[PDB]
Design a protein around this ligand. Structure first.
Ligand SMILES: O=C(O)C1=C[C@H](O)[C@H](O)[C@H](O[C@H]2[C@H](O)[C@H](O)[C@@H](O)O[C@@H]2C(=O)O)O1
Ligand SMILES: O=C(O)C1=C[C@H](O)[C@H](O)[C@H](O[C@H]2[C@H](O)[C@H](O)[C@@H](O)O[C@@H]2C(=O)O)O1
Ligand SMILES: [Ca+2]
Ligand SMILES: [Ca+2]
Ligand SMILES: [Mg+2]
Ligand SMILES: [Mg+2]
Ligand SMILES: [Mg+2]
Ligand SMILES: [Mg+2]
Lengths: 727, 727
């Protein structure tokens, strides 16, 4: 009784596509491009080489390309009704059938779960997700005898290999296991194998895995009390805001198996109600992911993330189209599809094409947003403050650990202006799929640099990373939201605390995005309040992008560059210059992509200002030679850092005009600096312009009245903060 | 008798413009933008502050902005027939008249010719060129009494100040003097003052200047026996190919006064035949300058050049429109005008707009080109070799000294792919008009780093710059063309020699851009043959752009960074790693803007391979932290460096696919290495792909027969080289 195809491309979908071909431009353009790709591969023949290589290498790239081409051939067969596509799928499947059973585990030994076609089970699982879709498309074209042999000798052994033979890969809450569960589930659905479908949804019972078993990136395989399978992978790593705990680079990857397998489940097993699971989180998570991109569509590089990954990727084409068709037809998704310029060649892609043709498209709104972390939304979060039409974007990370790929960077932030990074989060130390760089895999410096606290724009105590850079400790902890208030577009404030990163120390960081009179643009205000039980060394880095223009302090230029320290990331920084503050406010200004920036920070006379450059202890040139300025405050117990980051003016090498190149800050001053209250006065060099930010530190309640005095003057307000103009 | 205006905007021009307004989109759009700009400044008022500042500072930027706005107000007055513009010009001129006479020499003392309005006479001259045009536009609106006072108390004294009172500025063959000559000449022509007109054309008679005195940038003020004035500035620093000896950044700046003053001379003194002068060189030089830009229209950064200067600049808007109107109406110039998206608000800009409306536009062809240097084309040259549609561009500099801004860089090259710099020429050390960077003026490191040989991709002998970095030596010498042959678009070759850079050493460098079977793209072949009479240390830098991917040799990574040397630029390089070749060919690959590149060079086992990084002894962060690889060959007399630079493959962080990431070179071998003949064998990996280049070094005659033997086999050809496929 089951029709084929039916999981993703459906028979009713084929009919409708055919009726519309020639009058759906984005679809017609995709079809033509895909037809040319597949026809090219058909001319080259069928190559199924004996495994051997890591990423970037021939056997990896060939087997990878085969999976993409098979899924494309399948939809081409159905849409065009042209058997050359089916014959190619059939021949290729049988060539795999003739080699796969005789293969020995991948000869490369790095993976905690060595694959057969690829170095790791993750890529074997990618292959099966894509190939299942091809099989659904040729299932009726094949004879019963042919299906029986493929299922017995190719598909069933393959599905076992990436599941019951490698439970350490398959049975976790992790993007790996989501790929594995989907692979097993997609082929199960095509075949009507109820055992495999149950294994996909619920995992393996009694896996026998030992205590403390880890993956290659330092993460635990299993967590006590945690379920396995697809449904557990929806329930645990997504918050109620649709925020995926590994961060957006990983979320981007995981959306393919999440949304493909959900779509398949919706079409074949509607009683599962997969698109309702956890209050509709999968569909919601698509809007959330799109909001975690800068003005160019590039995902913010939180935790292990390669820069340049964006919503133009194949996973976001898939996610946008599926969310459009199976969700409530959000017309904002249509504008993303138009930017992508392609669609899936299936029912969901057609629906997007027709939505565009009918003039339904609306601009995707990028707004200030609060995202909770943890399954129940109580394990910290991430906040994005935006000004104007994405004119300025502040990303503040007060999240949980983030699994194996997570960084030791409680309360870090990064800053963007219209697609240009100004203060960065480093991302990963890996050149993804570039064979010549460690087989395209994680490099040693991902651990030694990238993940360490000193690499991030946040507080480092005693040259030690948050939670001593120990996964097993960090994974128990998260920062805590104090408050989020972005209702006033001119004055948006978020605040969070962290008391476990350094036991005996409390960090309370408040960030604001503020437009006020005297300034050409909004500025970022950063208040980092530190309470401790002992005198420590505190470092606060700012990793800035651009060319240094000016400072209001002197600094030394050493004749030779030495590393800043010996451990925990400090071995990777060259000491490029050492300054002493001239007064209460120190300034550093730079030029990046035609715009000037100024960092102003409240300094004491014993502060050290360290110019740094990344690149020490990097024998393979695995790290970028980016710079930073670190404020070091020695022998200090309780302290409050106060900083402003301004954007002003411009420079063009065409006109040779430099405009508004100086700061407009006259003075920043702490007026009150106690446990209960923090008050910062901001004086704008614009003649007469003064503002006062007051924070109540010990009670967040929006209806709580506060009464303080500053120089004999009473200030009275309700709620955790006030911003006032001083006249 | 003389009409006003008539120099640049003419009265028949004004009538034709008014008849066409509203049906000439590029002109209509420009008029609207300029109207809004001038109307804004009129609302702000008239400010003529007491001069104090360097470039980027308030008084410099305000007086500069006034000159641009006055010239815009003048054409607006005429075109729109609206006396608001004329009244603004009058009021501003009278405000200048009230202050100028009482002003003392600019108080900044860092110009060899301090101005009055500005720190230097160069900028006073800019002001007068622009204001002259405005005066022409309001001449009839003013009363005779008003003109008399302006002329007596502002214009005549101004013109004298920048000329007869500062002959050291005014009477040279130099871009400065071209601006000074045009300033005096433009105001002379508006006024009908024969004295000033002659002074402009023919210079100051008996100037009394010392021969051997220097300007602040280290070049000679005056050359014995050399004429002065506008005509001398056309005859002397332009070659017969329209190449301006100072290089394209400076040529760009000089075109404004050259073409503006030439246009005024054409309209007011047609008997001068200015557009025929030196065989039409001024019109020709516009094409030449456009040919000295990369695929994005950015000028190659030869000699003192700021990167990002482009044909979108105000000077090239001006040059393009004038050359179109007064030259032979070359329709290729119309495509540049379309990219610029604006035109001059005058007769020439009208002619461009009409050319575009009538569909005359044709694409500007960027070709391989040989440019001679020196007034008679015998003082070396510059070669540009291009492949395909600016797919790859090699720039080879074998020029004369280049006057004061020239670099010690005989036979250096740079390499570009579709607007991306792959191997660079550093350009200047100066942040043009950015006050915070030493007043926007040349920095100390422009002499200590930028101009030195070690900063360039060319031979350095015994850690010493060409000509010992002395202007008085280098200014007497030039490299010599051996041959240029670009007729075969697959195999283009240029060769030059230099024997005075290091007395007792001969450098013979041959560069080729070669497309052959077995390579996806054209490659650069570089043969640097060196003959000497002592054993020396030879250094060969390659300043590459991008992320290091791979080497075929081991290298050390020191625990601290030390400077590479003590003098002549080596004090600005950190030694970042030291390698020794493993074989006959050493390889370095990198990734830049999505593409891979491989440098392969013939090494002896005693060679040292130095990774370097610019930035030592740079206390104010005036230098970029770019990298290089230096080949160092010690204790060597005669040697030949052979290198290939390939472009291959692609990387995308969206798809995460790395394609064709390895070199296709199997080997390069020197088959013959004598004074008379050089032969280089290139084997591609494809196997069956082998090529041989043979150079005859002591006879360039295209009809001379050569017979040689290599490995027992006879090779016979005519002319200075042969490139043959070995079968
Ligand atoms: O194709 C891939 O192997 C791949 C693509 C994703 O974009 C992402 O880079 C993913 O990283 C893996 C990695 O290959 C290892 O399996 C391990 O470190 O886990 C990573 C992950 O969890 O995403 O790999
Ligand atoms: O506005 C300028 O001062 C200016 C514009 C040109 O683009 C170019 O940069 C030029 O440089 C001058 C410099 O200001 C000094 O006058 C001296 O060093 O000479 C340079 C030159 O001849 O170009 O300045
Ligand atoms: Ca990070
Ligand atoms: Ca140079
Ligand atoms: Mg998961
Ligand atoms: Mg942004
Ligand atoms: Mg001035
Ligand atoms: Mg470029």
């Amino acid at each position: 009784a089951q029709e084929h195809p039916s999981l993703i491309l459906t028979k009713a979908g084929v009919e409708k596509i055919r009726a519309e071909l020639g009058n759906i431009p984005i679809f017609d353009a995709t079809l033509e491009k895909v037809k040319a790709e597949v026809d090219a591969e058909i001319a080259l023949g069928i190559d199924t080489p004996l495994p051997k290589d890591y990423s970037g290498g021939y056997t990896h790239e060939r087997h990878k390309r085969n999976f993409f081409i098979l899924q494309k051939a399948g939809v081409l067969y159905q849409i065009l009704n042209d058997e050359k596509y089916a014959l190619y799928i059939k021949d290729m499947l049988f060539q795999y059938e003739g080699m796969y059973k005789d293969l020995p585990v991948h000869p490369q030994t790095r993976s905690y779960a060595r694959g057969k076609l690829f170095w790791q089970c993750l890529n074997d699982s990618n292959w099966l997700v894509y190939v299942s879709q091809a099989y659904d498309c040729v299932y009726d074209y094949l004879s019963k005898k042919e299906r029986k042999q493929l299922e017995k000798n190719l598909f069933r052994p393959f599905a076992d290999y990436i599941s019951i033979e490698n439970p350490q890969f398959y049975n976790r809450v992790h993007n790996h296991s989501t790929w594995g569960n989907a692979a097993v589930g997609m082929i199960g659905l095509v075949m009507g194998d109820e055992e495999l479908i149950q294994r996909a949804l619920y995992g393996i019972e009694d896996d026998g895995l030992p205590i403390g078993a880890k993956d290659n990136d330092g993460g635990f395989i299993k967590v006590e009390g945690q379920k396995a399978g697809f449904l557990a992978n929806i329930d645990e790593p997504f918050s109620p805001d649709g925020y995926y705990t590994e961060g957006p680079y990983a979320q981007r990857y995981a959306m393919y198996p999440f949304l493909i397998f959900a779509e398949a489940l919706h079409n074949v097993r509607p009683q599962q109600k997969i698109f309702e699971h956890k209050d509709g989180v999968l569909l919601k998570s698509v809007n959330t992911l799109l909001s975690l991109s800068d003005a160019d569509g590039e995902f913010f590089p939180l935790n292990d993330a390669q820069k340049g990954m964006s919503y133009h990727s194949r996973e976001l084409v898939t996610a946008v189209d599926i969310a459009y068709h199976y969700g409530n037809h959000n017309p904002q998704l249509l504008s993303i599809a138009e930017e992508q310029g392609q669609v899936l060649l299936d029912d969901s892609g057609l629906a997007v094409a027709l939505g565009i043709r009918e003039g339904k498209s609306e601009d995707f709104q990028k707004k200030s947003i609060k995202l909770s972390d943890g399954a129940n939304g109580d394990q910290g979060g991430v906040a994005i403050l935006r000004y104007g039409n994405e004119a300025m974007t502040l990303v503040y990370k007060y999240a949980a650990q983030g699994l194996s790929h997570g960084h030791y960077d409680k309360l870090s932030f990064s800053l963007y202006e219209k697609g240009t990074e100004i203060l960065q989060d480093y991302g990963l130390a890996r050149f993804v799929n570039i064979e010549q760089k460690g087989g395209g895999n994680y490099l040693k410096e991902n651990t030694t640099w990238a993940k360490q606290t000193i690499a991030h724009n946040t507080l480092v105590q005693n040259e030690t990373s948050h939670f001593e850079g120990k996964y097993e400790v960090g994974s128990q902890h998260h920062s805590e939201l104090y408050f989020f208030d972005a209702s006033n577009p001119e004055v948006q404030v978020v605040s969070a605390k962290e008391q476990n990163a350094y036991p005996g120390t409390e960090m309370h960081r408040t960030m604001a995005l503020i437009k006020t009179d005297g300034f050409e643009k909004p500025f970022v205000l950063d208040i980092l309040r530190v309470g401790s039980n002992a005198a420590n060394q505190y470092d606060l880095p700012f990793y800035f992008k651009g060319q240094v223009m000016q400072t209001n302090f002197d600094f030394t230029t050493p004749k030779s560059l030495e590393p800043l320290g010996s451990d925990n990331g400090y071995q990777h920084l060259w000491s490029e210059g050492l300054g002493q503050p001239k007064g209460d406010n120190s300034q550093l200004s730079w030029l990046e992509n035609g715009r000037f920036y100024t960092l102003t920070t409240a300094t004491n006379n014993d502060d050290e200002l360290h110019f740094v450059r990344i690149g020490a202890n990097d024998p393979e040139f695995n790290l970028r030679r980016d710079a930073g300025l670190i404020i070091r405050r020695k022998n200090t117990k309780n302290t409050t850092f106060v900083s402003i980051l301004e954007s002003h003016g411009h420079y063009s090498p065409v006109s040779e005009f430099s405009v508004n190149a100086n700061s407009s800050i006259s003075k920043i001053e702490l007026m009150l600096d106690t446990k209960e209250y923090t008050a910062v006065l901001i004086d704008a060099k614009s003649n007469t312009e003064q503002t006062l930010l007051i924070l109540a530190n010990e009670n967040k309640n929006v209806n709580k009245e506060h009464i303080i005095e500053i120089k004999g003057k009473e200030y009275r307000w309700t709620g955790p903060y006030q911003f006032i103009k001083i006249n």
